[PDB]
Short mmCIF file of C-alpha atoms and ligand atoms in Angstrom, two decimals:
data_model
loop_
_atom_site.label_atom_id
_atom_site.label_comp_id
_atom_site.label_asym_id
_atom_site.label_seq_id
_atom_site.Cartn_x
_atom_site.Cartn_y
_atom_site.Cartn_z
CA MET M 1 -23.06 21.48 0.10
CA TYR M 2 -20.37 23.09 -2.06
CA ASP M 3 -23.04 25.59 -3.15
CA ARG M 4 -22.97 27.13 0.33
CA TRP M 5 -19.27 27.97 -0.11
CA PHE M 6 -18.51 28.24 -3.84
CA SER M 7 -20.31 30.38 -6.40
CA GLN M 8 -21.85 28.49 -9.30
CA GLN M 9 -19.26 30.14 -11.55
CA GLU M 10 -16.50 28.77 -9.31
CA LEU M 11 -18.11 25.32 -9.22
CA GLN M 12 -17.61 25.17 -13.00
CA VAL M 13 -13.81 25.27 -12.55
CA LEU M 14 -13.64 23.40 -9.24
CA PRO M 15 -12.80 19.73 -9.98
CA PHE M 16 -14.36 18.69 -6.68
CA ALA M 17 -17.87 19.45 -8.11
CA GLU M 18 -17.70 17.27 -11.28
CA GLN M 19 -18.75 13.61 -11.03
CA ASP M 20 -15.79 11.55 -12.39
CA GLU M 21 -15.40 8.28 -10.33
CA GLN M 22 -11.60 8.14 -10.97
CA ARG M 23 -11.40 11.43 -9.05
CA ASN M 24 -13.86 10.10 -6.35
CA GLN M 25 -12.21 6.65 -6.15
CA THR M 26 -8.83 8.44 -5.83
CA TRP M 27 -10.02 10.28 -2.69
CA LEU M 28 -11.86 7.24 -1.34
CA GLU M 29 -8.48 5.48 -1.50
CA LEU M 30 -6.43 8.35 -0.05
CA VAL M 31 -8.82 8.87 2.88
CA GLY M 32 -9.28 5.17 3.61
CA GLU M 33 -5.52 4.69 3.69
CA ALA M 34 -4.97 7.69 5.97
CA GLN M 35 -7.48 6.32 8.48
CA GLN M 36 -5.81 2.89 8.34
CA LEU M 37 -2.39 4.31 9.19
CA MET M 38 -3.94 6.28 12.06
CA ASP M 39 -5.70 3.17 13.37
CA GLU M 40 -2.35 1.33 13.33
CA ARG M 41 -0.77 4.24 15.27
CA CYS M 42 1.53 4.83 12.31
CA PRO M 43 3.83 7.79 13.04
CA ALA M 44 3.89 10.68 10.60
CA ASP M 45 7.61 10.19 9.86
CA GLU M 46 6.92 6.69 8.46
CA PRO M 47 7.69 6.19 4.74
CA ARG M 48 4.12 5.02 4.09
CA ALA M 49 2.79 8.10 5.89
CA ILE M 50 5.19 10.44 4.08
CA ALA M 51 4.43 8.91 0.67
CA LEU M 52 0.68 9.18 1.31
CA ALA M 53 1.00 12.80 2.46
CA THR M 54 2.91 13.78 -0.68
CA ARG M 55 0.32 12.14 -2.94
CA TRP M 56 -2.33 13.87 -0.83
CA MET M 57 -0.91 17.34 -1.51
CA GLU M 58 -0.36 16.58 -5.19
CA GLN M 59 -3.97 15.49 -5.63
CA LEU M 60 -5.33 18.38 -3.55
CA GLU M 61 -3.51 20.95 -5.69
CA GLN M 62 -4.82 19.28 -8.87
CA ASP M 63 -8.43 19.17 -7.64
CA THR M 64 -8.36 22.82 -6.55
CA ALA M 65 -7.22 23.83 -10.07
CA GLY M 66 -4.03 25.15 -8.48
CA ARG M 67 -6.12 27.96 -6.99
CA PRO M 68 -5.10 28.67 -3.37
CA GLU M 69 -8.33 30.63 -2.89
CA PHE M 70 -10.17 27.31 -3.21
CA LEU M 71 -7.80 25.73 -0.69
CA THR M 72 -8.61 28.47 1.83
CA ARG M 73 -12.31 27.87 1.12
CA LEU M 74 -12.09 24.16 1.95
CA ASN M 75 -10.35 24.98 5.25
CA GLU M 76 -13.23 27.35 6.02
CA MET M 77 -15.58 24.42 5.38
CA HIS M 78 -13.65 21.97 7.56
CA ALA M 79 -13.95 24.44 10.44
CA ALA M 80 -17.49 25.72 9.81
CA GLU M 81 -19.35 22.95 7.95
CA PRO M 82 -20.71 20.16 10.19
CA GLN M 83 -21.31 18.04 7.08
CA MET M 84 -17.63 18.01 6.02
CA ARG M 85 -16.71 15.17 8.39
CA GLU M 86 -19.61 12.95 7.26
CA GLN M 87 -19.61 13.99 3.60
CA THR M 88 -15.89 13.55 2.86
CA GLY M 89 -14.59 11.28 5.63
CA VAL M 90 -11.80 13.83 6.23
CA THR M 91 -11.51 14.71 9.92
CA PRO M 92 -9.51 17.54 11.51
CA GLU M 93 -7.36 14.87 13.17
CA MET M 94 -6.70 13.38 9.73
CA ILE M 95 -5.59 16.75 8.35
CA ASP M 96 -3.21 17.14 11.29
CA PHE M 97 -1.73 13.73 10.48
CA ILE M 98 -1.25 14.54 6.78
CA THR M 99 0.17 17.96 7.65
CA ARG M 100 2.76 16.43 9.99
CA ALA M 101 3.68 13.69 7.50
CA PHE M 102 4.13 16.19 4.66
CA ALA M 103 6.28 18.40 6.90
CA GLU M 104 8.40 15.34 7.67
CA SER M 105 9.01 14.87 3.94
CA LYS M 106 10.57 18.35 3.80
CA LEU M 107 12.48 18.02 7.09
CA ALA M 108 14.00 14.86 5.60
CA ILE M 109 15.39 17.07 2.83
CA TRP M 110 16.36 20.03 5.02
CA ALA M 111 18.40 17.68 7.24
CA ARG M 112 20.95 17.52 4.41
CA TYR M 113 21.23 21.33 4.29
CA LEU M 114 21.00 22.26 7.99
CA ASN M 115 23.00 21.40 11.09
CA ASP M 116 21.55 19.55 14.07
CA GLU M 117 20.59 22.73 15.94
CA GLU M 118 19.10 24.51 12.91
CA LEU M 119 17.08 21.41 12.01
CA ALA M 120 15.85 21.02 15.60
CA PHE M 121 14.65 24.64 15.61
CA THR M 122 12.78 24.23 12.32
CA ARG M 123 11.22 20.92 13.33
CA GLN M 124 9.72 22.65 16.37
CA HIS M 125 8.65 25.93 14.76
CA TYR M 126 7.61 24.75 11.29
CA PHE M 127 4.03 24.36 12.58
CA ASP M 128 3.87 27.67 14.48
CA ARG M 129 2.36 29.72 11.62
CA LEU M 130 2.03 27.02 8.95
CA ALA M 131 -1.74 27.43 8.54
CA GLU M 132 -1.33 31.07 7.46
CA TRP M 133 0.53 30.27 4.22
CA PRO M 134 -2.53 29.53 2.01
CA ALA M 135 -4.07 32.95 2.72
CA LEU M 136 -0.77 34.60 1.76
CA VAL M 137 -0.32 32.54 -1.42
CA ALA M 138 -3.84 33.52 -2.53
CA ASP M 139 -3.03 37.21 -2.05
CA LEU M 140 0.17 36.68 -4.05
CA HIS M 141 -1.75 35.13 -6.95
CA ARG M 142 -4.15 38.09 -6.81
CA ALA M 143 -1.38 40.70 -6.85
CA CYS M 144 0.09 38.90 -9.87
CA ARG M 145 -3.18 38.80 -11.82
CA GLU M 146 -3.91 42.49 -11.15
CA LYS M 147 -0.36 43.41 -12.26
CA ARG M 148 0.26 45.03 -8.87
CA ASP M 149 3.62 46.78 -8.58
CA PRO M 150 5.89 44.76 -6.25
CA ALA M 151 7.34 48.05 -4.97
CA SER M 152 3.92 49.44 -4.03
CA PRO M 153 2.88 49.58 -0.36
CA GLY M 154 0.52 46.64 -0.80
CA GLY M 155 3.16 44.58 -2.57
CA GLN M 156 5.72 45.28 0.14
CA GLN M 157 3.15 44.21 2.73
CA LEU M 158 2.89 40.83 0.99
CA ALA M 159 6.70 40.62 0.98
CA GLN M 160 6.68 41.48 4.69
CA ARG M 161 4.18 38.71 5.47
CA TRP M 162 6.24 36.18 3.51
CA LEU M 163 9.29 37.17 5.55
CA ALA M 164 7.29 36.84 8.77
CA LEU M 165 6.11 33.31 7.94
CA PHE M 166 9.52 32.27 6.58
CA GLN M 167 11.47 33.53 9.60
CA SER M 168 8.92 31.77 11.83
CA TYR M 169 10.45 28.37 11.04
CA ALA M 170 13.84 29.30 9.55
CA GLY M 171 14.87 31.86 12.17
CA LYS M 172 16.41 35.30 11.88
CA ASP M 173 19.96 34.12 11.11
CA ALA M 174 21.07 35.28 7.67
CA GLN M 175 23.40 32.32 7.12
CA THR M 176 20.69 29.81 8.04
CA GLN M 177 18.16 31.51 5.77
CA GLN M 178 20.63 31.25 2.88
CA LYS M 179 20.66 27.47 3.32
CA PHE M 180 16.87 27.38 2.99
CA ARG M 181 16.87 29.44 -0.20
CA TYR M 182 19.70 27.32 -1.63
CA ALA M 183 17.85 24.10 -0.79
CA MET M 184 14.71 25.59 -2.35
CA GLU M 185 16.67 26.09 -5.58
CA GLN M 186 17.99 22.50 -5.63
CA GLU M 187 14.99 20.48 -4.36
CA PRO M 188 11.78 20.51 -6.44
CA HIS M 189 9.92 18.65 -3.69
CA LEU M 190 10.33 21.63 -1.35
CA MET M 191 7.92 23.59 -3.59
CA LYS M 192 5.24 20.89 -3.53
CA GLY M 193 2.07 21.68 -1.62
CA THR M 194 2.61 25.44 -1.94
CA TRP M 195 0.26 26.34 -4.83
CA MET M 196 3.14 28.53 -6.03
CA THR M 197 3.78 28.98 -9.77
CA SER M 198 6.90 30.29 -11.51
CA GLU M 199 4.95 33.50 -12.35
CA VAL M 200 3.93 34.20 -8.69
CA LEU M 201 7.29 33.12 -7.33
CA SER M 202 8.86 35.57 -9.80
CA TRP M 203 6.54 38.34 -8.61
CA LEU M 204 7.29 37.49 -4.98
CA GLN M 205 11.05 37.56 -5.51
CA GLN M 206 10.89 41.00 -7.10
CA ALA M 207 8.93 42.21 -4.06
CA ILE M 208 11.50 40.64 -1.73
CA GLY M 209 14.23 42.28 -3.79
CA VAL M 210 12.81 45.76 -3.25
CA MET M 211 12.40 44.99 0.46
CA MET M 212 16.16 44.39 0.68
C1 FWW V 1 10.26 28.85 2.11
O1 FWW V 1 10.66 28.51 0.79
C2 FWW V 1 10.56 29.54 -0.13
C3 FWW V 1 9.26 29.89 -0.55
N1 FWW V 1 8.10 29.23 -0.04
C4 FWW V 1 6.76 29.46 -0.28
O2 FWW V 1 6.41 30.37 -1.04
C5 FWW V 1 5.68 28.66 0.37
C6 FWW V 1 4.33 28.80 0.09
C7 FWW V 1 3.35 28.05 0.72
C8 FWW V 1 3.62 27.07 1.70
N2 FWW V 1 2.58 26.37 2.30
C9 FWW V 1 1.31 26.11 1.84
O3 FWW V 1 0.97 26.53 0.75
C10 FWW V 1 0.33 25.39 2.65
C11 FWW V 1 -0.68 24.59 2.18
C12 FWW V 1 -1.58 23.95 3.03
C13 FWW V 1 -1.52 24.10 4.41
N3 FWW V 1 -2.45 23.51 5.26
C14 FWW V 1 -2.18 22.65 6.36
O4 FWW V 1 -1.05 22.31 6.69
C15 FWW V 1 -3.44 22.23 7.06
C16 FWW V 1 -4.56 22.91 6.34
N4 FWW V 1 -5.50 22.06 5.65
C17 FWW V 1 -5.13 21.15 4.64
O5 FWW V 1 -3.94 21.06 4.33
C18 FWW V 1 -6.10 20.29 3.96
C19 FWW V 1 -5.85 18.95 3.65
C20 FWW V 1 -6.78 18.15 3.01
C21 FWW V 1 -8.04 18.62 2.60
N5 FWW V 1 -9.04 17.80 1.94
C22 FWW V 1 -10.36 18.12 1.61
O6 FWW V 1 -10.74 19.24 1.91
C23 FWW V 1 -11.38 17.23 0.95
C24 FWW V 1 -12.75 17.63 1.15
C25 FWW V 1 -11.22 16.09 0.26
C26 FWW V 1 -12.32 15.25 -0.34
C27 FWW V 1 -12.53 13.92 0.02
C28 FWW V 1 -13.55 13.14 -0.52
C29 FWW V 1 -14.42 13.69 -1.46
O7 FWW V 1 -15.42 12.93 -2.00
C30 FWW V 1 -14.25 15.01 -1.84
C31 FWW V 1 -13.22 15.76 -1.28
C32 FWW V 1 -8.28 19.96 2.92
C33 FWW V 1 -7.35 20.75 3.57
C34 FWW V 1 -3.82 23.67 5.23
O8 FWW V 1 -4.39 24.33 4.36
C35 FWW V 1 -0.52 24.93 4.89
C36 FWW V 1 0.37 25.54 4.05
C37 FWW V 1 4.97 26.93 2.02
O9 FWW V 1 5.28 25.99 2.97
C38 FWW V 1 5.27 26.46 4.39
C39 FWW V 1 5.95 27.69 1.38
O10 FWW V 1 7.24 27.45 1.76
C40 FWW V 1 9.20 30.93 -1.48
C41 FWW V 1 10.34 31.58 -1.97
C42 FWW V 1 11.62 31.23 -1.55
C43 FWW V 1 12.89 31.94 -2.08
O11 FWW V 1 13.92 31.25 -2.13
O12 FWW V 1 12.77 33.14 -2.41
C44 FWW V 1 11.70 30.19 -0.62
O13 FWW V 1 12.92 29.78 -0.16
#
C-alpha cells in the first residue's frame, strides 16, 4: 500500500513501513481511544481529547521522521486511497476531531495572551487555511536544504505565503500579531505539530526580515 505512494528509498526512512509492534500497538491505542471519545460524543475541548490530540501530533511527527513531505503524502493517501480507512482505522472524521482538539490546546494558551475579541476571531478563523501549512513547511525545509537565499524571489514567496496563512487566523492588526509572536517565544507547546526545526525557523525569520 505504502509502495503506491512512497519510493522504496523513502520507505527505508519512513518509520511507518518498519514492523515494530511498540510502534503498531501505539497507533492501535491512539486510534482506538479517538474512536471511543467520538462514540461518547466527547467534545474536542475536553482534557482527554486535548491530551490525546497532543500525543497524536507528537507521535505523528516522530513516525514521519520529522519530514513534512511525508505528512503531505499521508494526507494525499487519506483523500485518494480507498484502503486507508480499512488499513489504518483512521477516518476523515477522526482527523477532523484530532485537528479540532489540537487547535483547542493552542487556543487554551492563546487565551492568556489575547483579549476576548482577538481570541474569538482566531477561534473562528484558525481552521480557514489550516490544511495548507504542511505544504508550506515542506517547501521551507527544501529551501533550507538547498541553501536558497531568503532574499531571493522564491524565498520571499515562501515568506509571503507564511504571512498569508498567519494573518488568516491572527488578523492584520500589528499589535495583535505581536502578541502571537511573543506567545510563540514563551510557549514551547505552540510549536508542536508544526514539523518546524530551529534551522528552518531561522531561515524563515530571515526571509520575513527581508520582507519587512
Ligand atoms: C504562527 O506561529 C509562528 C510560526 N508558525 C509556524 O511556522 C507553523 C507551521 C505549521 C503549522 N501547522 C502544521 O504544520 C500542520 C500540521 C498538520 C495539519 N493537518 C490537519 O490539521 C489535518 C491534516 N491531517 C492530519 O493532521 C493527519 C492526522 C493523522 C494522520 N494519521 C495517519 O495518517 C496514519 C495512517 C496513522 C496510522 C495508523 C495505524 C497504522 O497501523 C499506521 C498508521 C494523518 C494526517 C493535516 O495535515 C495542519 C497543519 C502551524 O500551525 C498552524 C504553524 O503555526 C512560525 C514563526 C513565528 C514567528 O514568531 O516568527 C510564529 O509566530
